[PDB]
Short mmCIF file of C-alpha atoms in Angstrom, two decimals:
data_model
loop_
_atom_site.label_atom_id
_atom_site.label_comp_id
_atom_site.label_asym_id
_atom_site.label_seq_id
_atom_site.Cartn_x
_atom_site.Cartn_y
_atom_site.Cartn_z
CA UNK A 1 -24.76 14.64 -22.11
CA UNK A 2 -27.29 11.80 -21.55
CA UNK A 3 -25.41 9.53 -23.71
CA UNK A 4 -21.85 10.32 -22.86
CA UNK A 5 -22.40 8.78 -19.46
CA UNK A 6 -23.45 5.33 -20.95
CA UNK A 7 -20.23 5.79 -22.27
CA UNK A 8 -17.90 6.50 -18.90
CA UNK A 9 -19.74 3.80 -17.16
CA UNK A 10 -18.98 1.46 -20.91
CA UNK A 11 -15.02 2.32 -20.08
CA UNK A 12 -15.14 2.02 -16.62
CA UNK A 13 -16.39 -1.60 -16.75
CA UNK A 14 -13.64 -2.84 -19.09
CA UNK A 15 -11.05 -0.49 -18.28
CA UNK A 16 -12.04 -3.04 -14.72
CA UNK A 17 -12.11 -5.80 -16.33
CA UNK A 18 -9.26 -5.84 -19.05
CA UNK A 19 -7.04 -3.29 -17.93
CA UNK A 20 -6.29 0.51 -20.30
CA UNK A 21 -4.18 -0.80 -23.19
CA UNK A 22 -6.11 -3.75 -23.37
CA UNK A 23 -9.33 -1.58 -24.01
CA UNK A 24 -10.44 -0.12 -27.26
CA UNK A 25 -11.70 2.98 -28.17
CA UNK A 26 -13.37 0.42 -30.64
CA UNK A 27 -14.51 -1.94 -27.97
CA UNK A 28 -15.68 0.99 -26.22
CA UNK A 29 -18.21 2.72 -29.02
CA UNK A 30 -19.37 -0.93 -29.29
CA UNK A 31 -20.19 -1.51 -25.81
CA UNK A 32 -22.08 1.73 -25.43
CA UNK A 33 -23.88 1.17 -28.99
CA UNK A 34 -22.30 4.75 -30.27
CA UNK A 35 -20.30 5.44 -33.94
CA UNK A 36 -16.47 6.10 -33.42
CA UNK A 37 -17.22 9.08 -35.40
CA UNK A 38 -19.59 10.05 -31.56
CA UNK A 39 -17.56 8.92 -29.33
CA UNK A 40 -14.45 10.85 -30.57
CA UNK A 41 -16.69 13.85 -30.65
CA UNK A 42 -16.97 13.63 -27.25
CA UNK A 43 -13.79 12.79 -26.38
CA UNK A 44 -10.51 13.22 -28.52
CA UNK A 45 -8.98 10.13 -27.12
CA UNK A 46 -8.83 7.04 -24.92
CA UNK A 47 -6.04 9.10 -22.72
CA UNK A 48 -8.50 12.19 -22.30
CA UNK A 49 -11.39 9.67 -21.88
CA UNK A 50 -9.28 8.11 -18.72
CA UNK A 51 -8.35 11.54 -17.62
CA UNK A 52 -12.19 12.53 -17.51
CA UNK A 53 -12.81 9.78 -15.29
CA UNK A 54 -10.32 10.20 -13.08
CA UNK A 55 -10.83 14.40 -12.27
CA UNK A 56 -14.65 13.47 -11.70
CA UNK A 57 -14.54 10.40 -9.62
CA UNK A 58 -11.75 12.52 -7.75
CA UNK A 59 -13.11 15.86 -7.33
CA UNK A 60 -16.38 13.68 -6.09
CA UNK A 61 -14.57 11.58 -3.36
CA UNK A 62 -12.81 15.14 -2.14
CA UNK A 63 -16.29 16.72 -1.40
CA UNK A 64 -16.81 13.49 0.66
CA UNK A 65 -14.47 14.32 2.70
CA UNK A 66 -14.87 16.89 5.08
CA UNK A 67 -13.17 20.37 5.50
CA UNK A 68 -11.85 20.00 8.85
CA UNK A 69 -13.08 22.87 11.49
CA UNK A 70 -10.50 23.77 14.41
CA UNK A 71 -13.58 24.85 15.97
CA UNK A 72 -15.26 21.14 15.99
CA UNK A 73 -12.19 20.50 18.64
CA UNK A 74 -8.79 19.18 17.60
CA UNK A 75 -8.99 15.91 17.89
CA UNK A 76 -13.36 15.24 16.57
CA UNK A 77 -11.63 17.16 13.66
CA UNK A 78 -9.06 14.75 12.89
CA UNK A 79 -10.96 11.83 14.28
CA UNK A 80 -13.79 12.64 11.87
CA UNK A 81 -11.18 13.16 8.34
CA UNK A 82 -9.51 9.97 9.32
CA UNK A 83 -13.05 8.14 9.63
CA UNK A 84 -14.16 9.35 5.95
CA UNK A 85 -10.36 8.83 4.71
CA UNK A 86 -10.70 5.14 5.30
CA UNK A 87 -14.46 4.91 4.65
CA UNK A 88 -13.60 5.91 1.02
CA UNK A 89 -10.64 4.14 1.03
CA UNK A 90 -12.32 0.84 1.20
CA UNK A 91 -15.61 1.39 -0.33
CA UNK A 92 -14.46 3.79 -3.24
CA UNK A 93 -12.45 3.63 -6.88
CA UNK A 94 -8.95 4.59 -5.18
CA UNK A 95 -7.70 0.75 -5.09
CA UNK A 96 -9.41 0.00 -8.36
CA UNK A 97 -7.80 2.99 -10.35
CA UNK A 98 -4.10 2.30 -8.81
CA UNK A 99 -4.59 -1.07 -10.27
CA UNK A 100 -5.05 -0.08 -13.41
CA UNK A 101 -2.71 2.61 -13.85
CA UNK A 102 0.23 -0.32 -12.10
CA UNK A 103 -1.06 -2.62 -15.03
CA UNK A 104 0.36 0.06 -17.42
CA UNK A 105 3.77 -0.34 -16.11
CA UNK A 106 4.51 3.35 -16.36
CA UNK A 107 3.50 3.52 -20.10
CA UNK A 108 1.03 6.58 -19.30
CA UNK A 109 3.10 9.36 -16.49
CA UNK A 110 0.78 11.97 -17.28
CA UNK A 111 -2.70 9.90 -16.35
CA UNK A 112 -0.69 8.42 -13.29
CA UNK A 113 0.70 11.92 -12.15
CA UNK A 114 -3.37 13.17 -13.05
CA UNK A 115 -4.41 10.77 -10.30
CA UNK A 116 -1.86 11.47 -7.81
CA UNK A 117 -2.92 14.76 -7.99
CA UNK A 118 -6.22 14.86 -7.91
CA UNK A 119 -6.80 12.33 -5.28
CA UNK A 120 -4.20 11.15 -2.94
CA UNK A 121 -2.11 14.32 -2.78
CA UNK A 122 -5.10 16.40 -2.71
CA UNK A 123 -6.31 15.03 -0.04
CA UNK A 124 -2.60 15.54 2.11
CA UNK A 125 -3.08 19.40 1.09
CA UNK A 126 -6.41 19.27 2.24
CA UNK A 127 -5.26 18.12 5.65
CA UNK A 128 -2.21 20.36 5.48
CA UNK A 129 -4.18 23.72 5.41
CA UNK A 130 -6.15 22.36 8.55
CA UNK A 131 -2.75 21.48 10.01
CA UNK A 132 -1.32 24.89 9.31
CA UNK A 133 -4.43 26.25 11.48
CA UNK A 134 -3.80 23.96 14.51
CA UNK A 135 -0.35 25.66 14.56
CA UNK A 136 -1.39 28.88 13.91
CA UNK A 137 -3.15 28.14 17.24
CA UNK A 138 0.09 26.33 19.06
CA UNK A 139 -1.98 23.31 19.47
CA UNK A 140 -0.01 21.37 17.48
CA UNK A 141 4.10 21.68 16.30
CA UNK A 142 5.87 20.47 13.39
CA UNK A 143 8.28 22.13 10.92
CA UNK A 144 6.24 20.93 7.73
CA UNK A 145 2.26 21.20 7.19
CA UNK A 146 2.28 18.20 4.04
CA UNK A 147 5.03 16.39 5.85
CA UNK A 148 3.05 16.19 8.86
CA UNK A 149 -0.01 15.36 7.36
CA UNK A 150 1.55 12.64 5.08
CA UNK A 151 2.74 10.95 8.41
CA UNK A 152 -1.04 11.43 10.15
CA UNK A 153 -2.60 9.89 7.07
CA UNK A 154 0.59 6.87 6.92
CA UNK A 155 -0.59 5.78 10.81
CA UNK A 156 -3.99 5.83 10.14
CA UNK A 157 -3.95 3.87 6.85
CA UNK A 158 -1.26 1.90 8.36
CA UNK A 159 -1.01 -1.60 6.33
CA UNK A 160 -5.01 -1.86 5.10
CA UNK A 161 -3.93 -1.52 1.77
CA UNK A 162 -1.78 -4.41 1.76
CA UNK A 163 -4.43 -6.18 3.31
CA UNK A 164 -7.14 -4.94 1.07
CA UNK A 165 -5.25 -6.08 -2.07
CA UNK A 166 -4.59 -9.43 -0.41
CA UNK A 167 -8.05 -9.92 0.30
CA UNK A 168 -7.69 -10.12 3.93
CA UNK A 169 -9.01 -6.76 4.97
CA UNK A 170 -12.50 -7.01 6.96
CA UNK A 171 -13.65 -3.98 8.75
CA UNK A 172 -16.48 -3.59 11.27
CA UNK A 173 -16.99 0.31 11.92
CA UNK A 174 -15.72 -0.67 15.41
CA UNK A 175 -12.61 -2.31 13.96
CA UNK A 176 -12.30 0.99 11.98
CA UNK A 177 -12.51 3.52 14.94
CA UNK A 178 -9.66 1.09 16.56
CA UNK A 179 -7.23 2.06 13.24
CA UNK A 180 -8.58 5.29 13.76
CA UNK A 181 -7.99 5.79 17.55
CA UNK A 182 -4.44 4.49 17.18
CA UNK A 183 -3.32 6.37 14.95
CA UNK A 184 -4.13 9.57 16.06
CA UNK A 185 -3.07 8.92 19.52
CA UNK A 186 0.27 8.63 18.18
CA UNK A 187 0.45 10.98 16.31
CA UNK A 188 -1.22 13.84 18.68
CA UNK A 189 1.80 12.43 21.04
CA UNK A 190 4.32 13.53 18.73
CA UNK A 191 3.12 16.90 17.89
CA UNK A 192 0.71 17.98 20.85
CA UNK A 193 2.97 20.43 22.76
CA UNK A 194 4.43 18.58 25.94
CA UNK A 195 3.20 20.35 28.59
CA UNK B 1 16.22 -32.22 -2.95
CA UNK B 2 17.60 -31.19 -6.43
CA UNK B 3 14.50 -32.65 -8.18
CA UNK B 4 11.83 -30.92 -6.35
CA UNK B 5 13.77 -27.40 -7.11
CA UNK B 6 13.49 -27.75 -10.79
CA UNK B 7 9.84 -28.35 -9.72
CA UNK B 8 9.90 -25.26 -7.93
CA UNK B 9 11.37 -23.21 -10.67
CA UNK B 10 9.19 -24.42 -13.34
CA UNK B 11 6.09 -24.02 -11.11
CA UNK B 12 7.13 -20.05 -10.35
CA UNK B 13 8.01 -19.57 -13.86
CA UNK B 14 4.25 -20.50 -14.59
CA UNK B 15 2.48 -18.90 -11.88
CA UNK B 16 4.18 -15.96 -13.32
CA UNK B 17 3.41 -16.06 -16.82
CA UNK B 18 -0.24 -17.44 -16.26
CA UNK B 19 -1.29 -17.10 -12.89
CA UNK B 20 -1.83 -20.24 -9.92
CA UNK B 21 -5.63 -21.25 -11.26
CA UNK B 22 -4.50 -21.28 -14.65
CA UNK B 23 -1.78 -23.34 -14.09
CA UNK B 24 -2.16 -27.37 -13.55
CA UNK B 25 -0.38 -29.88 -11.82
CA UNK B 26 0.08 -31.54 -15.06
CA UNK B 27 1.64 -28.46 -17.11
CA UNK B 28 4.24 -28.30 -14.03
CA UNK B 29 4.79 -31.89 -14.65
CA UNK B 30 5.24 -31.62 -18.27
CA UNK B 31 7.63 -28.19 -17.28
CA UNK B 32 9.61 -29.55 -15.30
CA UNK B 33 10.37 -33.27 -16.89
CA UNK B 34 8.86 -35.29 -14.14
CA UNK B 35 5.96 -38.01 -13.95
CA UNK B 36 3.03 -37.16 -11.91
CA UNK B 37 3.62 -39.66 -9.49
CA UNK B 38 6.95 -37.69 -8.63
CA UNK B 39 5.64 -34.61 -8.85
CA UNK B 40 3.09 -35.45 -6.31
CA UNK B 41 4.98 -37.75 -4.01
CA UNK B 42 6.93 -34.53 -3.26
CA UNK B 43 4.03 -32.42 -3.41
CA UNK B 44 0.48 -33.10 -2.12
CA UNK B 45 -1.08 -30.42 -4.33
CA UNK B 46 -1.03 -27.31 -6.08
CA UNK B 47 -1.97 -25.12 -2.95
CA UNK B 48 0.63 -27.05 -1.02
CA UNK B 49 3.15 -26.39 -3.89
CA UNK B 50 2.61 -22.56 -3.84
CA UNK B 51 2.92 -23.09 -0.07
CA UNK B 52 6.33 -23.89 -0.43
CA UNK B 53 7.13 -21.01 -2.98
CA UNK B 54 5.75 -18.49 -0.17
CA UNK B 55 7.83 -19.69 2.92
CA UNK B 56 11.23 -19.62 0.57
CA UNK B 57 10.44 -16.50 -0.80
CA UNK B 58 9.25 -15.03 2.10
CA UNK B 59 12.55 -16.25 4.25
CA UNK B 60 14.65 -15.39 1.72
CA UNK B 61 13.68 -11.60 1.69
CA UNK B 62 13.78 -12.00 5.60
CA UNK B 63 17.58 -12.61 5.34
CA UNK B 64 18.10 -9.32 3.40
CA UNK B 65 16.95 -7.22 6.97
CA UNK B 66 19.63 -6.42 9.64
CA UNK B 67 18.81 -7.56 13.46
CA UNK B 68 18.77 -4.62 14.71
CA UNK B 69 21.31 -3.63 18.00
CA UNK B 70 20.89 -1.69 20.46
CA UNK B 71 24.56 -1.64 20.97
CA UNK B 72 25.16 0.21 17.88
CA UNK B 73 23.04 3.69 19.02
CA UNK B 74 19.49 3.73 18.80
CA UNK B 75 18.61 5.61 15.94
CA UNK B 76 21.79 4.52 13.69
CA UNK B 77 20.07 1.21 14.53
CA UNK B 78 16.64 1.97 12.83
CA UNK B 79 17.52 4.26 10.50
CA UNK B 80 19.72 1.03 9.22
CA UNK B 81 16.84 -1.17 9.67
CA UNK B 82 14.42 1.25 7.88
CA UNK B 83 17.15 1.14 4.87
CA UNK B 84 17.31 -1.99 3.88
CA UNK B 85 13.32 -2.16 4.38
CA UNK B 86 12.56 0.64 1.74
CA UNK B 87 15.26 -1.71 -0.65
CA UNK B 88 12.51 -4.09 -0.80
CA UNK B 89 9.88 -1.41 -2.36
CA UNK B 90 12.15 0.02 -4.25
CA UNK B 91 13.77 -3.32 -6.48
CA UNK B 92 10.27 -4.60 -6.20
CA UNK B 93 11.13 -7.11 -4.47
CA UNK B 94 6.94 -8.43 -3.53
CA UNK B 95 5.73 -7.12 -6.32
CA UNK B 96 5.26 -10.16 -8.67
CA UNK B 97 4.55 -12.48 -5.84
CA UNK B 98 1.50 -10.10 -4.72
CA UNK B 99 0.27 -9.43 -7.95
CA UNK B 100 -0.19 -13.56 -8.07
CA UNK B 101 -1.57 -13.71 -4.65
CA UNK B 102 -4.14 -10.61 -5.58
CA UNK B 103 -4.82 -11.60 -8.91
CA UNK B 104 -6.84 -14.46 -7.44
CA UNK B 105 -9.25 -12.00 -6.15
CA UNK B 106 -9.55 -13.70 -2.41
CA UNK B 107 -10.34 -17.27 -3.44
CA UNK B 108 -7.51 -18.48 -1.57
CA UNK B 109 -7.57 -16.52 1.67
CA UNK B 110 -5.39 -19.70 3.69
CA UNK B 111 -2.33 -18.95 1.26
CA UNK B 112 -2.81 -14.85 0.97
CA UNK B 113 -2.63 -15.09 4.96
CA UNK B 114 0.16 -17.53 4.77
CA UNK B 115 1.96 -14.68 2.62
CA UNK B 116 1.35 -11.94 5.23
CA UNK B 117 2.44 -13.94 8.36
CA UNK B 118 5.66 -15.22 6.47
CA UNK B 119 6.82 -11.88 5.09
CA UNK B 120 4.75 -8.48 6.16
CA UNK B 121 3.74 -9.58 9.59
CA UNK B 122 7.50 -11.47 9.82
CA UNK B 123 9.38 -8.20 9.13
CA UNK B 124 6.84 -6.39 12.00
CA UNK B 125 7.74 -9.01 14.63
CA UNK B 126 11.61 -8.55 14.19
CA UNK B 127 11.55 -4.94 14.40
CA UNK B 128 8.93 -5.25 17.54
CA UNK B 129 11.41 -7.77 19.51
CA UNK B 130 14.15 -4.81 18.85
CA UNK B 131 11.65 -2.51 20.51
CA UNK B 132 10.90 -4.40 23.16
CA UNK B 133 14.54 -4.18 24.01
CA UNK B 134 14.89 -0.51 23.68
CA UNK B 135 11.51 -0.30 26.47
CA UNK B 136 13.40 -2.39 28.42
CA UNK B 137 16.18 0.00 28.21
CA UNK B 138 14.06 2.83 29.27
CA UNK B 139 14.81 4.82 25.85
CA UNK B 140 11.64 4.16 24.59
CA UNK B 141 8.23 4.56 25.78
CA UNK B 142 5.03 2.86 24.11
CA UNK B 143 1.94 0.18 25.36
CA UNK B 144 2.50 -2.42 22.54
CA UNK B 145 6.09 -3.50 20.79
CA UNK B 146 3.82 -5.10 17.52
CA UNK B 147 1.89 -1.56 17.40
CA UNK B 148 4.90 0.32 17.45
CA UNK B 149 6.63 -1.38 15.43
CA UNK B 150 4.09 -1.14 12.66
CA UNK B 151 3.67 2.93 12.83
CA UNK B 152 7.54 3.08 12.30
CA UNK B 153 6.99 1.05 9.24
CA UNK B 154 4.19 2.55 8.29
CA UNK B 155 6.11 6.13 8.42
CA UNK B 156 8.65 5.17 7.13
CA UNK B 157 7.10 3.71 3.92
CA UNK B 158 4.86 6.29 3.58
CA UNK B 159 3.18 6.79 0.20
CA UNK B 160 6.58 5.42 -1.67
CA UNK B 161 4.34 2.57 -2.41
CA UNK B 162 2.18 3.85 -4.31
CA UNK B 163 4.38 6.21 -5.96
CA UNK B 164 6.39 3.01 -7.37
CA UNK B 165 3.64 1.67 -8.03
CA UNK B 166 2.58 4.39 -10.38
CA UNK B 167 5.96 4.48 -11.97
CA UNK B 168 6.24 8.14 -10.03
CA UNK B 169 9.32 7.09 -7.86
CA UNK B 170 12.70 7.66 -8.32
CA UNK B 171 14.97 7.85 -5.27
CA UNK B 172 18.59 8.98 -5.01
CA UNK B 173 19.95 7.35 -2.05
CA UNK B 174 19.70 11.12 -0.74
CA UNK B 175 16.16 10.88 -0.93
CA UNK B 176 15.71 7.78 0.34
CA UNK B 177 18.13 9.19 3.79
CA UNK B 178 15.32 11.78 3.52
CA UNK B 179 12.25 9.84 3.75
CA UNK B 180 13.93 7.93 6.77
CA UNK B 181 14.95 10.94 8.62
CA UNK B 182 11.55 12.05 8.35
CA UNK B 183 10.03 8.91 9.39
CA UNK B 184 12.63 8.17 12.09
CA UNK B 185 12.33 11.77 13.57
CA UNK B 186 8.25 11.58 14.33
CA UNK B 187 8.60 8.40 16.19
CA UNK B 188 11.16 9.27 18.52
CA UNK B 189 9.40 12.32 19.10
CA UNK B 190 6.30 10.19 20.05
CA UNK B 191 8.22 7.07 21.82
CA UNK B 192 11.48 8.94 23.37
CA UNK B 193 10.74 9.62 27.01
CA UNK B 194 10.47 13.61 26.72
CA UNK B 195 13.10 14.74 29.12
#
């Protein structure tokens, strides 16, 4: 309990540094000072170790975000999920994770499909079911719920992941409310009922 | 002319197997079957040297993208233009290039930025000077050709991205007309003068 944390935070740090395949479940036990005969105790392998810290960095970034409330106002709602979408886009694991799941070059589907899953398509759905609501009301139209939150969360992310992974990505709050502001404009103008 | 290109093949080949700081003027030398006093009469350094690598690569993929024509129907227009864009994700086109570029971790922000102008920001400006025609034309409505332009893309690309990325993509050309038609739809219902 106390000690199997010393050893997520042991895999994190070279599963960082070195990539998955080039990690050990060796180098691992020896990092966080445990026998192999522990650390496959607690967990049966690297692949389930991986797994474990992918569902709980996940299911922790998704109660970060908010639930959206109709009732907040249509566009404070949205305004508000894109703000926290991009707040742990830059400052959380979602970059660092793709990276080493692309370094595997599609040795591990099941791990890569866990992560889609639990994070980025999680958080479309999330979006969705407050989409479904806004048409519920008719104060928004569109024939799909994920499609339409897919494209809300494409404006609003825009290209900041290229420029993240370049390294050229540099964002002020105030720069941030401008992706923000953008986006949603746009996208309010394609399914805000013209009236 | 012909001996800086074996230059530039042996230099790409070794970027690519060990990375740019890994990789010395003198190894490129030695690759290539040139003295040093060649190698750097043509070339003033390594930075300039990757330099070079980045504008042909980057105007090389540039050629691969239709000019877009009004003449030929509006959407038939984009949709083609979004089709040959999405070929680049798909065959991977940027994928080695950017991993070199990223794998440097931001200590050479003057060449990552030299990247995004020549290819990223490149394809945005084409697509923007087609939009700026169809404004003119009165058949589309927006404040900024550069914005636009870059909310079609990103629509349009979506989360394929990442999907490749992850080794989760596999596209029929059916689903590729899918992801376009999709893309393509929600901007004209934002930019078409409703009418």
């Amino acid at each position: 309990g106390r000690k199997m944390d010393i050893v997520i935070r042991a895999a994190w740090q070279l599963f960082l540094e070195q990539g998955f395949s080039a990690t050990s479940m060796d180098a691992i036990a020896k990092a966080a000072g445990v026998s192999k005969a522990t650390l496959y105790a607690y967990f049966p392998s690297k692949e389930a170790l991986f797994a474990s810290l992918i569902v709980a960095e996940c299911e922790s970034l998704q109660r970060d975000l908010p639930v959206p409330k109709l009732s907040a106002g249509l566009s404070e709602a949205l305004r508000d999920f894109a703000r926290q979408y991009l707040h742990t886009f830059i400052h959380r694991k979602d970059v660092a994770f793709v990276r080493i799941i692309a370094n595997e070059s599609g040795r591990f589907p099941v791990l890569a499909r866990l992560f889609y899953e639990s994070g980025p398509e999680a958080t479309i759905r999330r979006l969705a079911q407050f989409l479904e609501e806004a048409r519920a009301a008719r104060v928004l139209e569109f024939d799909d719920p994920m499609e339409a939150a897919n494209q809300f969360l494409s404006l609003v992310r825009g290209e900041l992941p290229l420029l993240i992974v370049l390294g050229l990505s540099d964002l002020t709050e105030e720069a941030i409310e401008q992706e923000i502001e953008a986006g949603l404009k746009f996208f309010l103008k394609a399914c805000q009922p013209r009236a």
